[PDB]
Amino acid sequence: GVRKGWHEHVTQDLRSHLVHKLVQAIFPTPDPAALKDRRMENLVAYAKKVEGDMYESANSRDEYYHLLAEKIYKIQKELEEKRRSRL
């Protein structure tokens, strides 16, 4: 739905922790020398753009979480299809 000014109740700290969740959900890893790699930094950069786009597309905080969850799901399925086609 539409909640006027819902951005005023979403702090920058929350968005940044949400960006971290998108990364963790797409590529779970206990930093085995991974956060420093270029390929992981490109993921963080793509995750910020996904969060940025859904932050403006959504019109309430419930839409925000909904669209993000559906975008993560679609990215996981894509990663999982490419991982299979390589077996």
Binding site: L14, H17, L18, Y65, L68, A69, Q76, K77
Partner: peptide, 24 residues
């Protein structure tokens, strides 16, 4: 098509909502 798509999406929704762990 994917029979668990609805299940996985709801699991992801909860994952994100639980971030609000910053002050709980």
């Amino acid at each position: 098509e994917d029979p668990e798509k609805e299940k996985r999406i709801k699991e992801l929704e909860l994952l994100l909502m639980s971030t609000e762990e910053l002050k709980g």
